[PDB]
Design brief:
covalent inhibition; 3 domains; transferase; dimeric; Aspartate Aminotransferase, domain 2; binds a molecule of 2 linked components (BF5-PLP); alpha/beta; globular; Aspartate Aminotransferase, domain 1; homodimer; 11 helices
Chain lengths: 412, 412
């Protein structure tokens, strides 16, 4: 717990800038900006108002890690939900820290870039989010698939993958033990599957034994259909080995590009220093919109909002499941998603569905997404389809599945 | 040209993503988003309204390269202002293209990352923007400093540096010829100096002869006090070797994080692929704000706005020079700024200004910035101070230079 062995020479080289009447600053005059006030309504909520001075702040440069009121609020959220062991540690031993990012993707991308040298080994479970595979591809790592099933990563397959390395080689710089394990523990995209609490503990003990980081990409954390959320990897992180990406895109707004990253201070500080020379900071304006909403909501309002969105997505899930039962019984296999917005469907008797969907189905005015995109080798044939239930009506799902069943029959 | 010479292994490896009733999409339902309408007022202009449908768009994911209306408007802007030779070249030659970025610093950071292998040579004039120095340092390039004066880079210094290679070394992959020249041609930060039209021609000829890219970082372009703007490198780009970064930060809003990158289509494509796996897209809400303003203003509003802001900063410039003349003529030297928001002051007495500006000027009442931050070797002593004239009244300035004027007189 220095973290040096985890990171690249470029990342380690990064330095903070060498930076009443102030003539020392580089702020444009915000009085020159054309936008003067703003009012944003909130459904059954307090309107967000930027008066004259607040608008000038919204339209001006702000701190790289995020605005202070949003960072304190998010720190208290993390403490209440996850009580990470790491809040009481010194900085060097991995004290809990946070930064607002321009979506959770930015956080992840910056973390991957911080850590990966050409040839490094990284573990994850395929099928995996494609934006992650596309981020990892040009970095030259070996991606090693860990087996999974309806309950996520199978600790026993991780265990036997890891048995090719020696635990004592972890801190040897000339031995290529894995740098991290990446997973989406709730509502994995594309499969819909979630990790159980017993599996998490087992995986955490492995990460400690072989001494690698866990990158917990958890954008569907607040979209769990049975409304009991099991402990996160961050909540059990006695070692300071977890970096966690949370997203507001699925519950508050995707277009505002605001997410946040939580983890060991030294690693968060590397990410912040990279952000500082790229985007500089997240939109000051969008941070304030969100900070205002959250502060006025408090616990009462936030819980109520997330309950309503969970209730919406589980009605949708019940609908797509009804439609799959009606049309696809005996033609395909699927598990009930625990969270998220996707159903993952294995078509029986066909080796690759990409012919059938990317071509035949679209003539019929319907498309779902073939599973090839979610593998490291997307050229391999895949019998799977991802179907989203975020938007389609009960009626649209029915026709969509009616059409798919037709195609599967004709193809056979 | 083909551009492969100037692109890293990692950047060349980037691929576009893989991925009518459609269940194929990964969009969250925007009806779940809590913000519902927005009203933004514009000084002496049309109030901007986001009604319920428009708000939904503003709060949702959008294209990586930028929203189509902002793109088409920006392209017509560049054509109108710079009429670049490359608009009708085939893609592989440098066909002009453009993408919106999350500030102009994101554009520059991604261009540097796309190009630099450790050990590469890049050319630039010091003192230079601290943010580009901080971005370049971790990439492990050799920064070769090119000499400059009140008219910017001196071509003859550039000619001498380039004499260490033969013109024919450029396409020889075994020779480490420079990848690019970086400069800020108008109101350099910190110096306030600008390039003349005559030097730009001589510099472009050297870039052609030794075949390197020019990166035109031009955030202060619309802030030219000499209310006739000098032709840009982009406007003379017969070879498709220029990448230009423009910013709305000084004229519209720094906190909204909206800038644009213009240059050869194959390089623009490499930058868009990198943004797809990091920020995904610039905030859709902030793009819509800007694009409504710009389309409502048209060209009469837009040039009327810049005229008004030039006039403001021009007055601030006169005020600060009048204050530098009144209290400083003798103790320090300075050039008159051609554009931007900074005055660069050489204090004549001492080797390092950090003595009397940090410990001794903070314990007075004024702040200026030690010139140390703007050199590759920021530890080396600097007699220079950067003073901004964006904000402070004639009043405050008068006192600020009064205080400084005394502080100088005590250490002599
Ligand atoms: C020559 C040159 N080239 C590119 C850019 C980048 O412009 P964008 O289009 O906005 O990406 C610039 C502009 N450089 N500015 C200099 C000023 N700088 C910062 C401030 F003015 C203020 C500031 C704060 O107040 C602050 C805080 O509240 O803690 C933090 N920071 C601030 C600045 O940058 C560092 C951090 C984020 C912004 C960039 C250019 O001149
Ligand atoms: C498992 C997992 N992990 C992290 C993230 C990161 O999300 P953040 O929003 O950064 O917090 C995700 C989310 N993945 N989504 C998948 C879907 N994808 C895009 C769309 F859904 C829709 C979309 C459009 O409609 C669109 C347009 O209208 O032009 C453009 N684009 C769209 C997507 O991305 C590509 C471009 C921007 C975004 C990320 C996750 O699942």
């Amino acid at each position: 717990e220095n973290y040096a062995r985890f990171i690249t020479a470029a990342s380690a080289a990064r330095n903070p800038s060498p930076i009443m009447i102030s003539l020392a600053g580089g702020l444009p005059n915000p009085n020159m900006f054309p936008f003067k006030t703003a009012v944003i309504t909130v459904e059954n909520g307090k309107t967000i108002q930027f008066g004259e001075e607040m608008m000038k702040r919204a339209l001006q440069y702000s701190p790289s890690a995020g605005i202070p009121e949003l960072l304190s609020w998010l720190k208290q959220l993390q403490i209440k939900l996850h009580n990470p062991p790491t809040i009481h540690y010194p900085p060097s031993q991995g004290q809990m820290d946070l930064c607002v990012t321009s979506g959770s993707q930015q956080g992840l991308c910056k973390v991957f870039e911080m850590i990966i040298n050409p040839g490094d080994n990284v573990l994850l479970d395929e099928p995996a989010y494609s934006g992650t595979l596309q981020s990892l591809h040009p970095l030259g790592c070996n991606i090693i698939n860990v087996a999974s099933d309806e309950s996520g990563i199978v600790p026993d397959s991780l265990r036997d993958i890891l048995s090719r390395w020696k635990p004592e080689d972890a801190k040897n710089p000339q031995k290529n033990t894995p740098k991290f394990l990446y997973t989406v523990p709730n509502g994995n995209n594309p499969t819909g599957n979630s990790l159980t609490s017993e599996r998490k503990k087992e995986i955490y003990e492995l990460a400690r034994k072989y001494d690698f980081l866990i990158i917990e990409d958890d954008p569907y954390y607040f979209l769990q259909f049975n409304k009991f959320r099991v402990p996160t990897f961050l909540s059990m992180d006695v070692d300071g080995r977890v970096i966690r990406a949370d997203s507001f895109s699925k519950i508050i707004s995707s277009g505002l590009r605001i997410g946040f990253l939580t983890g060991p201070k030294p690693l968060i500080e590397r990410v912040i220093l990279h952000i500082q020379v790229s985007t500089l900071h997240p939109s000051t304006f969008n941070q304030l919109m969100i900070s205002q909403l959250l502060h006025e909501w408090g616990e009462e309002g936030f819980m109520a909002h997330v309950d309503r969105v969970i209730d919406f997505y589980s009605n949708q899930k019940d609908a797509i499941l009804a439609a799959a039962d009606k049309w696809l019984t005996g033609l395909a296999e699927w598990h009930v998603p625990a969270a998220g917005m996707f159903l993952w469907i294995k078509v029986k008797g066909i080796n690759d569905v990409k012919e059938l969907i990317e071509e035949k189905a679209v003539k019929m005015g319907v498309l779902m997404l073939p599973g090839n995109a979610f593998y490291v080798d997307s050229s391999a044939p895949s019998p799977y389809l991802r179907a989203s239930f975020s938007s389609a009506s009960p009626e649209q799902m029915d026709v969509a599945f009616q059409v798919l069943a037709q195609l599967i029959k004709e193809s056979l």
